[PDB]
Write a structure and sequence with these properties.
mainly alpha; 79% helix; homodimer; binds zinc ion
């Protein structure tokens, strides 16, 4: 459905905290949209923002996101 | 795909921290599985666990999860 949190807003907030995490998440978002799941893309970006706000390293963020994508 | 983080493990961890949040998440998980998106259910449970570990109130958790479900 339309509406809800903006994936672009989430990506924006990631960029302000760590562009390295924004870059890895933007790539996952692009692939997930191509597989036809924008909501999954939004969950991934939202999750990365929670973890980055708590000081999780980019590599640990990526590992965590991959497990939710299996 | 099979594998990845267990939704039951997440629900278990929610219950240990606040059974009120486990209960509201279990209901969302049941509905999301019925709509044929178990991965969405798992994202919701994982998100609730991050927020509950940070001290977010059950009502604020529910509001946040709903916005990701729009
Ligand atoms: Zn929607
Ligand atoms: Zn969230
Ligand atoms: Zn899977
Ligand atoms: Zn997570």
């Amino acid at each position: 459905g339309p509406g809800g949190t903006s994936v672009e807003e989430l990506l924006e907030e990631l960029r302000k905290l760590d562009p390295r995490v924004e870059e890895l998440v933007r790539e996952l978002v692009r692939k997930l949209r191509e597989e036809g799941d924008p909501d999954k893309a939004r969950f991934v970006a939202d999750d990365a923002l929670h973890l980055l706000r708590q000081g999780v390293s980019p590599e640990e963020i990526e590992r965590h996101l991959r497990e939710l994508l299996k």
